[PDB]
Design an enzyme around this catalytic site. Structure first.
Site, PDB file in Angstrom:
ATOM      1  N   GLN A   1     -15.708  62.170  60.875  1.00  0.00           N
ATOM      2  CA  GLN A   1     -16.311  61.414  59.785  1.00  0.00           C
ATOM      3  C   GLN A   1     -17.279  62.279  58.995  1.00  0.00           C
ATOM      4  O   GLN A   1     -17.224  62.326  57.761  1.00  0.00           O
ATOM      5  CB  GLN A   1     -17.020  60.184  60.344  1.00  0.00           C
ATOM      6  CG  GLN A   1     -17.608  59.273  59.293  1.00  0.00           C
ATOM      7  CD  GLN A   1     -18.713  58.404  59.852  1.00  0.00           C
ATOM      8  OE1 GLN A   1     -19.896  58.677  59.648  1.00  0.00           O
ATOM      9  NE2 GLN A   1     -18.336  57.349  60.565  1.00  0.00           N
TER      10      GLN A   1
ATOM     11  N   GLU B   1     -10.399  57.792  63.499  1.00  0.00           N
ATOM     12  CA  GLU B   1     -10.757  56.436  63.142  1.00  0.00           C
ATOM     13  C   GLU B   1      -9.976  56.011  61.913  1.00  0.00           C
ATOM     14  O   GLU B   1      -9.762  56.831  61.011  1.00  0.00           O
ATOM     15  CB  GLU B   1     -12.262  56.330  62.872  1.00  0.00           C
ATOM     16  CG  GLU B   1     -12.834  54.934  63.048  1.00  0.00           C
ATOM     17  CD  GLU B   1     -12.736  54.100  61.789  1.00  0.00           C
ATOM     18  OE1 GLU B   1     -12.769  54.682  60.684  1.00  0.00           O
ATOM     19  OE2 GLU B   1     -12.624  52.861  61.902  1.00  0.00           O
TER      20      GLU B   1
ATOM     21  N   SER C   1     -18.113  67.994  62.812  1.00  0.00           N
ATOM     22  CA  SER C   1     -19.355  67.426  63.313  1.00  0.00           C
ATOM     23  C   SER C   1     -19.350  67.444  64.835  1.00  0.00           C
ATOM     24  O   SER C   1     -18.529  66.777  65.470  1.00  0.00           O
ATOM     25  CB  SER C   1     -19.532  66.004  62.791  1.00  0.00           C
ATOM     26  OG  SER C   1     -18.539  65.141  63.315  1.00  0.00           O
TER      27      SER C   1
ATOM     28  N   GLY D   1     -18.008  63.208  69.490  1.00  0.00           N
ATOM     29  CA  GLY D   1     -16.932  63.808  70.261  1.00  0.00           C
ATOM     30  C   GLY D   1     -15.652  63.909  69.460  1.00  0.00           C
ATOM     31  O   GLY D   1     -14.996  64.953  69.439  1.00  0.00           O
TER      32      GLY D   1
ATOM     33  N   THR E   1     -29.186  60.926  66.761  1.00  0.00           N
ATOM     34  CA  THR E   1     -28.104  60.107  66.231  1.00  0.00           C
ATOM     35  C   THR E   1     -27.391  59.316  67.313  1.00  0.00           C
ATOM     36  O   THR E   1     -27.279  58.091  67.215  1.00  0.00           O
ATOM     37  CB  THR E   1     -27.088  60.984  65.488  1.00  0.00           C
ATOM     38  OG1 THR E   1     -27.736  61.656  64.402  1.00  0.00           O
ATOM     39  CG2 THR E   1     -25.960  60.126  64.941  1.00  0.00           C
TER      40      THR E   1
ATOM     41  N   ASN F   1     -29.339  68.341  60.513  1.00  0.00           N
ATOM     42  CA  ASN F   1     -29.550  67.340  59.475  1.00  0.00           C
ATOM     43  C   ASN F   1     -31.026  67.144  59.161  1.00  0.00           C
ATOM     44  O   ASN F   1     -31.384  66.943  57.996  1.00  0.00           O
ATOM     45  CB  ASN F   1     -28.914  66.017  59.885  1.00  0.00           C
ATOM     46  CG  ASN F   1     -29.416  65.530  61.217  1.00  0.00           C
ATOM     47  OD1 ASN F   1     -29.679  66.324  62.115  1.00  0.00           O
ATOM     48  ND2 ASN F   1     -29.556  64.218  61.356  1.00  0.00           N
TER      49      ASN F   1
ATOM     50  N   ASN G   1     -24.693  65.164  51.400  1.00  0.00           N
ATOM     51  CA  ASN G   1     -23.404  65.836  51.291  1.00  0.00           C
ATOM     52  C   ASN G   1     -23.344  66.732  50.062  1.00  0.00           C
ATOM     53  O   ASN G   1     -22.868  67.870  50.137  1.00  0.00           O
ATOM     54  CB  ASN G   1     -22.276  64.809  51.262  1.00  0.00           C
ATOM     55  CG  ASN G   1     -21.044  65.282  51.999  1.00  0.00           C
ATOM     56  OD1 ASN G   1     -20.621  66.428  51.848  1.00  0.00           O
ATOM     57  ND2 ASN G   1     -20.465  64.407  52.811  1.00  0.00           N
TER      58      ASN G   1
ATOM     59  N   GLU H   1     -14.519  89.707  53.344  1.00  0.00           N
ATOM     60  CA  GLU H   1     -15.648  90.640  53.380  1.00  0.00           C
ATOM     61  C   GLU H   1     -16.994  89.939  53.556  1.00  0.00           C
ATOM     62  O   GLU H   1     -17.934  90.201  52.807  1.00  0.00           O
ATOM     63  CB  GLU H   1     -15.649  91.497  52.120  1.00  0.00           C
ATOM     64  CG  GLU H   1     -14.393  92.329  51.939  1.00  0.00           C
ATOM     65  CD  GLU H   1     -14.466  93.238  50.728  1.00  0.00           C
ATOM     66  OE1 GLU H   1     -15.540  93.300  50.093  1.00  0.00           O
ATOM     67  OE2 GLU H   1     -13.450  93.891  50.412  1.00  0.00           O
TER      68      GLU H   1
HETATM   69  N1  GTP Z   1     -26.423  64.832  57.766  1.00  0.00           N
HETATM   70  C1  GTP Z   1     -25.396  63.996  57.903  1.00  0.00           C
HETATM   71  N2  GTP Z   1     -24.753  63.892  59.118  1.00  0.00           N
HETATM   72  C2  GTP Z   1     -23.709  63.046  59.260  1.00  0.00           C
HETATM   73  C3  GTP Z   1     -23.281  62.279  58.194  1.00  0.00           C
HETATM   74  N3  GTP Z   1     -22.239  61.530  58.604  1.00  0.00           N
HETATM   75  C4  GTP Z   1     -21.998  61.808  59.902  1.00  0.00           C
HETATM   76  N4  GTP Z   1     -22.907  62.738  60.327  1.00  0.00           N
HETATM   77  C5  GTP Z   1     -22.991  63.322  61.675  1.00  0.00           C
HETATM   78  O1  GTP Z   1     -21.906  62.878  62.466  1.00  0.00           O
HETATM   79  C6  GTP Z   1     -22.337  62.592  63.778  1.00  0.00           C
HETATM   80  C7  GTP Z   1     -21.476  61.507  64.410  1.00  0.00           C
HETATM   81  O2  GTP Z   1     -20.141  61.599  63.964  1.00  0.00           O
HETATM   82  P1  GTP Z   1     -19.721  60.908  62.572  1.00  0.00           P
HETATM   83  O3  GTP Z   1     -19.626  61.945  61.478  1.00  0.00           O
HETATM   84  O4  GTP Z   1     -20.706  59.825  62.209  1.00  0.00           O
HETATM   85  O5  GTP Z   1     -18.276  60.260  62.837  1.00  0.00           O
HETATM   86  P2  GTP Z   1     -17.128  61.090  63.591  1.00  0.00           P
HETATM   87  O6  GTP Z   1     -16.969  62.471  63.003  1.00  0.00           O
HETATM   88  O7  GTP Z   1     -15.841  60.304  63.539  1.00  0.00           O
HETATM   89  O8  GTP Z   1     -17.644  61.145  65.104  1.00  0.00           O
HETATM   90  P3  GTP Z   1     -17.728  59.758  65.895  1.00  0.00           P
HETATM   91  O9  GTP Z   1     -18.890  58.982  65.331  1.00  0.00           O
HETATM   92  O10 GTP Z   1     -17.945  60.021  67.364  1.00  0.00           O
HETATM   93  O11 GTP Z   1     -16.451  58.990  65.681  1.00  0.00           O
HETATM   94  C8  GTP Z   1     -23.784  62.162  63.630  1.00  0.00           C
HETATM   95  O12 GTP Z   1     -24.550  62.638  64.708  1.00  0.00           O
HETATM   96  C9  GTP Z   1     -24.252  62.815  62.350  1.00  0.00           C
HETATM   97  O13 GTP Z   1     -25.107  63.887  62.654  1.00  0.00           O
HETATM   98  C10 GTP Z   1     -23.918  62.376  56.977  1.00  0.00           C
HETATM   99  O14 GTP Z   1     -23.534  61.694  56.034  1.00  0.00           O
HETATM  100  N5  GTP Z   1     -24.979  63.236  56.831  1.00  0.00           N
HETATM  101 MG    MG Z   2     -15.851  57.536  64.669  1.00  0.00          MG
END
Ligand code: GTP
Ligand code: MG
Ligand code: GTP
Ligand code: GDP
Ligand code: GDP
Ligand code: MG
Lengths: 430, 95, 439, 51, 433
Positions: free
Chosen positions: C11, C71, C140, C144, C179, C206, C228, C254
């Site tokens: 996500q 998801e 991210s 997980g 988070t 973040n 973002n 490079e």
């Molecule tokens: N800075 C920032 N971090 C984000 C943002 N969206 C998600 N994250 C990071 O993503 C982590 C959790 O995963 P998500 O991106 O929310 O969703 P995901 O990639 O599907 O991972 P899951 O939540 O486990 O399903 C959080 O700890 C955030 O640090 C965002 O818009 N800004």
């Molecule tokens: Mg998710």
């Protein structure tokens, strides 16, 4: 996709459903005839989560209704949104249990299980992908609490890899409803804890506490209790139906609130909750959200949350609000009560956001925290259970249908096994 | 006529600055929002505004916003341009 | 004849990919539908968009992206959104079940039935090109789902595509802002995933983003969508040298030849400036001397690490805009004279400077205001030890009582995997210290 | 001095034209050229088209 | 390519800094909005180019309370000052000398000092620092002393100037100035090179004697001081046959390392109602410049001795008259010069005429002279405070609210000792060899 189905048990399970679809119906824009009259397109994109598709374009909840007497079952259909349930799904007996748990666990409940389990299997299979079951019943009814759990255990033995959400109500000490409550309420905890994954507890005593302290209305009825409980349930699956920044499915909340497989107890609460007086006296600002979230009086569970120490918790905001305050504002709470947080589990708050808020307000939040203070509910009930056993009072009923006294002893130790085992982590130090 | 929003580091209060949220802008843009009423007000919702949710209705589109900024900019200094004459401006008694 | 595709997982990965594609969009003037404007009837020239787009002969231009996620809601939004006619319809493969922060679930059980299509999707876009230069990975860690499918993707790609370099800008757990509650596991285990199989990774905590926004943008209430956009401009500058002609290009191949001294130590964090709000931008001349000076301002580093605690060994700086080389030479010298920031003993030269002519393109309704000068950094310093060492404390404390270890055992992951993970991360902490001692 | 007031506002506009080369050498009589005119700081750009 | 940084600290210094900009602003033709009138590097002294159109005055304002700073942020000068260089906090010191230097001061200087540093880097010709502050408030010394104390260790040999404002001999505002002033005098004596007394009381006498206005307000006072800076600096950025630079100042008004306080006077100050009735002769203009009454500070020069004076002529003054102008002064017996310093003047000739503010008091004239000179009569100012200051300490009243802010009790002991040390020395210079 990633949907679950619903199963209810007993009058309390029956009645609670009456509004849960009533509460759900308004937010999903379902008219009582099953026709769509919504105003937003996204109000149908994820509609499959709680509604199937059939002829004529009308939708029907995929619920299983089951009872041991006809008075409650026939009653629901005539209520608002009560015609949604399908007729074939209903299955009922003709005997009546009457708070005799032993009656509801071996003879009457088991005999009719064949259809109730059968009606369960058909609904789940047809889906594209099952996610789990949400169960709401009451431990105060022998037919309910007994036959309520018996369906629970079998479900696990058929599907091991799915989550299983549990809702119910337990009797508080000061406010009492049945003199035979302790036996059936505590026994069911034995079977549930061995199979239940997520928590199930909510205390009526605090339910009415919120009724007068916050809502400050003069004379509440059973309408109020159904209203507050259902909305909280809508909070559990709020993000699972609409888009959001960080969605939070059951498992994700499941993944972040169970330190160990057995300690699976949570206390739920809803905010903000104000009466007509402060509807426009108060200001809906983030400082209000947290301030009313962690205080006891909003906590619907009898256990005092300030006499223990939290092990972990998470929140599910609803409505659109800048995340930053979500990050630090939760950060401030995690320190300013420095002692109030156990020491070995760092960063013990989980957060999420939902964009489409429940109707009636622009923003709302639900609390879900596993607080070691829950032990009070067992201990208060635990004390009662042992007392009624020593004198051999009321042992004639349950022993008249094939149940022996050996089982009662085992349950006595296990529950005390839980309470003895539950308190150990509360004082744990690193 | 004021000045139709303030500079970044201005102490004080701005009408609906803590009552209707208004999250997302740098600050200069937010400041102008308050005085010229454009926001819901009151703990209520018009069906249209519910369902902008983030991805579905913001951070998208393209050139429609560009005409929005140009219209928005013109109405900040243009009201501010209401001052001229080789006498500076009322510094003596305005303070 | 230069091509670079995008790999997106998670996500946080998906949305960051969402913004970056848009930032690519407005930069060249291509409308969402594929026709450039509704009017441009000459074209057939100015071949610059080949870097991030491929021609269809006539009409739209398909992004070199493949969207993956565990998801359905977040991905489904992208298709039903306002860019429904831009991304390739079938390249956005989506799963059916979530991982839910269960790395063990995301790395042994569910990711296997999605990776198979993932190679097919990658192989499809890669072949059409002819000069594949590098891969961009936004994953991210703090989720997980981002880790497993994201982690596995780095592994599988490590055995088929051979020696081609790969780049990644990661997002690890915040110091105090939290988070999730299981981030320490997915964070610690993940580091092993990319330590031995990723060329380059970057630190984008973040929290620093939140603080960075407030000090200059003047936003006391910033949200993700603001976060973002700032990131993409970081992406925009680094890759900008590959499609805008300039007096000195810096090829995607490079950087790592100049920004990684040994195989083990392969982590760098970046910083951005200037970043000024509409109410204050024009008021300053944004001279070159000042812009670079803010570049090393310890308070404004994009990730909350303290480079003051140590030295610097590798860093390459890209300039884009109308600056002149005289401006570059003077700024560097002033840095060499300074005493608050020092250099390691064995790197007598530590300024890899690039120059670009085209100005970074400003978005409508964005946080940034119109600007002309622009310079971005990718710096390595011994100060990165703070992030892991502080987390190193975090992983053990929970593992002391094996709380929450019960789930991760049951998903098929062996108990011993956690045994090795702590050892390797220890060496990196051990490895960092050794290079820090002068000869 | 490099003009500033113009290139903060008058850059979005960009002009494109088409034309055919002219010169003595017959080698360059029938190809096609595109001339680009940026309105910011009086810049002229040229590209060669290849069928 | 020569630049000077202005540091204004203090509400009373705030407006005066506010006041000093309107006069400066209207001399180079820069309209208040910021766009240049349209049509030479002479403006570089007090201004810097932003790239196109407007300009950024090299301004740094400080005051722990937002009300005074907000007004400038809301008046008709919004677009001139830098948007974020008006550092502002949350709470006021409440006139205490301690809260501004041991309770709240440090939490702002971190955002403060960094602001000072950048202004130089963008420049090349830092000539010196001028500091404006109010002693009669807890904030004035706290932030002001801290910067001057702090500023003594970040740049070093580079000089600095300060226009303080102590309380009047008999006109005051509070009962706490006698304390907060004495401690502040301790700080500046070892961190500033030169400063000129500007006690307010004399200004009211100055305003009433000539302008013929009987209801002066605080704003009118500020303009006088605001123009005072111009003559002290006017020579810097105008064409002239004989200029005086910022650095060419301490070499003429500092007889020794310690004594560096001089009291100034300004004239002619004639209201437009009656400014056309006299020839305004350079010979007569200078003579009124030395009359004891018109002294810009309530410290009579006649009671004291004289060591050195540097004054600037602006307008169309013919040099020979000045030479004839100075000569007669040596003859008089009202001011009798000094034994070891037979000559104590540094003559400066500056061309451009002083500008006029609309709707104010000052009239338009083609001749004038401003002075910045020292004398032993300045020994009166500290004595009068000295006599007062000892009076309160006999009961320690109001001291408990200074220690309770973290200031050591012994601190007050050291401060009063130094003042005496400075007090005795002035007797040393006045005694002829
Ligand atoms: N800075 C920032 N971090 C984000 C943002 N969206 C998600 N994250 C990071 O993503 C982590 C959790 O995963 P998500 O991106 O929310 O969703 P995901 O990639 O599907 O991972 P899951 O939540 O486990 O399903 C959080 O700890 C955030 O640090 C965002 O818009 N800004
Ligand atoms: Mg998710
Ligand atoms: N010349 C002049 N002096 C002033 C003015 N306003 C106040 N003062 C002097 O300043 C003294 C009090 O200190 P102020 O500067 O006014 O207040 P401050 O420095 O902000 O101290 P705080 O109010 O505690 O923040 C008074 O005794 C006045 O003599 C003014 O407008 N012009
Ligand atoms: N708060 C609340 N509790 C209810 C409601 N209906 C039933 N209950 C609970 O259910 C218990 C009685 O359940 P009962 O029907 O006898 O159980 P059963 O015999 O197994 O069906 C009481 O103790 C109540 O606490 C209701 O509408 N509101
Ligand atoms: N006759 C005459 N003498 C001058 C002129 N300008 C300066 N002086 C003399 O030069 C002396 C000042 O020298 P100065 O400029 O300070 O030397 P510097 O400090 O090395 O620059 C004065 O005493 C004047 O008498 C001039 O134009 N004509
Ligand atoms: Mg004040």
């Amino acid at each position: 996709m990633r949907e679950i189905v619903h199963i209810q048990g007993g009058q309390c399970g029956n009645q609670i459903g009456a509004k849960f679809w009533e509460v759900i119906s308004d937010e999903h824009g379902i008219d009582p005839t099953g026709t769509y009259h919504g105003d937003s397109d996204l109000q149908l994109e994820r509609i499959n989560v709680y509604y199937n598709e059939a002829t004529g374009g009308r939708y029907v909840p995929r619920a299983i209704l089951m009872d041991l007497e006809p008075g409650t079952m026939d009653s629901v259909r005539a209520g608002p949104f009560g015609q949604l349930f399908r007729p074939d799904n209903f299955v009922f007996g003709q005997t009546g249990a009457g708070n005799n748990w032993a009656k509801g666990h071996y003879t009457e409940g088991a005999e009719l299980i064949d259809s109730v389990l059968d009606v369960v299997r058909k609904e789940a299979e047809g889906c594209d992908c099952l996610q789990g079951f949400q169960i709401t019943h009451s431990l105060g009814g022998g037919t309910g609490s007994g036959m309520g759990t018996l369906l629970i255990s079998k479900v696990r033995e058929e599907y091991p890899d799915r989550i299983m959400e549990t809702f119910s109500v337990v009797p508080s000490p000061k406010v009492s409803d049945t003199v035979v409550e302790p036996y059936n309420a505590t026994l069911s905890v034995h079977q549930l804890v061995e199979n239940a994954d997520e928590c199930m507890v909510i205390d009526n005593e605090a339910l009415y506490d919120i009724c007068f302290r916050t809502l400050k209305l003069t004379t509440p009825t059973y309408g109020d209790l159904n209203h507050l409980v259902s909305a909280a349930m809508s909070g559990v699956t709020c993000c699972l139906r609409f888009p959001g920044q960080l969605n939070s499915d059951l498992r994700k909340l499941a993944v972040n609130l169970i330190p160990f497989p057995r300690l699976h107890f949570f206390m739920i609460g809803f905010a903000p909750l104000t009466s007509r007086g402060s509807q426009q006296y108060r200001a809906l600002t983030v400082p209000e959200l947290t301030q009313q979230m962690f205080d006891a009086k909003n906590m619907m569970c009898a256990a005092d949350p300030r006499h223990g120490r939290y092990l972990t918790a998470s929140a599910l905001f609803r409505g659109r609000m800048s995340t930053k305050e979500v990050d630090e504002q939760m950060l401030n709470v995690q320190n300013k009560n420095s002692s109030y947080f156990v020491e070995w589990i760092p960063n013990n708050i989980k957060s999420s956001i939902c964009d489409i808020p429940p109707k009636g307000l622009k923003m709302a939040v639900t609390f879900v925290g596993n607080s070691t203070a829950i032990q009070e509910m067992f201990k208060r009930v635990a004390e009662q259970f042992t007392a009624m056993f020593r004198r051999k009072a009321f042992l004639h009923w349950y022993t008249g249908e094939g149940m022996d006294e050996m089982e009662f002893t085992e349950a006595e130790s296990n529950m005390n096994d839980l309470v003895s085992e539950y308190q150990q982590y509360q004082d744990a130090t690193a | 006529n004021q000045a139709k929003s303030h500079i970044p580091g201005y102490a004080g209060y701005i009408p609906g600055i803590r009552s209707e949220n208004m999250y997302g802008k740098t600050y200069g843009k937010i400041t102008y929002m308050s005085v010229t009423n454009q926001h819901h007000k009151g703990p209520d919702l018009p069906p249209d505004l519910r369902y902008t949710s983030t991805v579905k209705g913001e951070f998208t589109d393209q050139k429609g916003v560009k005409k929005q900024e140009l219209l928005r900019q013109a109405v900040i200094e243009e009201a501010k341009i209401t001052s001229s004459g080789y006498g500076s401006s009322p510094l003596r008694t305005k303070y | 004849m230069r091509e670079v595709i995008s790999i997106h997982v998670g996500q946080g990965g998906i949305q960051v990919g969402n913004a970056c594609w848009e930032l690519f969009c407005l930069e060249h003037g291509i409308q969402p539908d594929g026709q450039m404007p509704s009017d441009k009837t000459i074209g057939g020239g100015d071949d610059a968009f080949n870097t991030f787009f491929s021609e269809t002969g006539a009409g739209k231009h398909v992004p070199r992206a493949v969207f993956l996620d565990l998801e359905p809601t977040v991905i489904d939004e992208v298709r039903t959104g306002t860019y429904r006619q831009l991304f390739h319809p079938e390249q956005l493969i989506s799963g059916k079940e979530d991982a839910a922060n269960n790395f063990a679930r995301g790395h042994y059980t569910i990711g296997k039935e999605i990776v198979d299509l993932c190679l097919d999707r990658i192989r499809k876009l890669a072949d059409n090109c002819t000069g594949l230069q590098g891969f961009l990975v936004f994953n991210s860690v703090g989720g997980g789902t981002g880790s497993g499918l994201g982690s596995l993707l780095l592994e599988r790609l490590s055995v088929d595509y051979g020696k081609k370099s790969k780049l990644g800008f990661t997002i690890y757990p915040s110091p105090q802002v939290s988070t999730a509650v299981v981030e320490p596991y997915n964070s610690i285990l993940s580091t092993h995933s990319l330590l031995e199989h990723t060329d380059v990774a970057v630190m984008l905590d973040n929290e620093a983003i939140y603080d960075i926004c407030r000090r200059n943008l003047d936003i006391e209430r910033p949200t993700y969508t603001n976060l973002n956009r700032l990131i993409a401009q970081v992406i925009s500058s680094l890759t900008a040298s590959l499609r805008f002609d300039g007096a000195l290009n810096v090829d995607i191949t490079e950087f790592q030849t100049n920004l990684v001294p040994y195989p083990r130590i392969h982590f760098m964090l970046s910083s951005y400036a200037p970043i000024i709000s509409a109410e204050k931008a024009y008021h300053e001349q944004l001279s070159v001397a000042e812009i670079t000076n803010s570049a090393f301002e310890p308070a404004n580093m994009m990730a909350k690490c303290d480079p003051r605690h140590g030295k610097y060994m590798a860093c390459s700086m890209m300039y884009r805009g109308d600056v002149v080389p005289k401006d570059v030479n003077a700024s560097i010298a002033t840095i060499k004279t300074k005493r608050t920031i020092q250099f390691v003993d064995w790197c007598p030269t530590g300024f890899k400077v690039g120059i670009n002519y085209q100005p970074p393109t400003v978005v409508p309704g964005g946080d940034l205001a119109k600007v002309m000068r622009a310079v971005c950094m990718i710096s390595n310093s011994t100060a990165i030890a703070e992030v892991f060492s502080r987390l190193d404390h975090k992983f053990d404390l929970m593992y002391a009582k094996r709380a929450f270890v019960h789930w991760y055992v049951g998903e098929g992951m062996e108990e011993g995997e956690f045994s090795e993970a702590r050892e390797d991360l220890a060496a990196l902490e051990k490895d960092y210290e050794e290079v820090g001692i002068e000869t | 001095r490099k003009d500033i007031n113009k290139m903060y506002t008058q850059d979005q506009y960009i002009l494109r034209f088409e034309g055919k080369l002219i010169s003595q050498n017959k080698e360059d009589n029938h190809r096609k050229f595109i001339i680009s005119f940026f309105c910011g700081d009086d810049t002229i750009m040229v590209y060669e088209t290849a069928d």
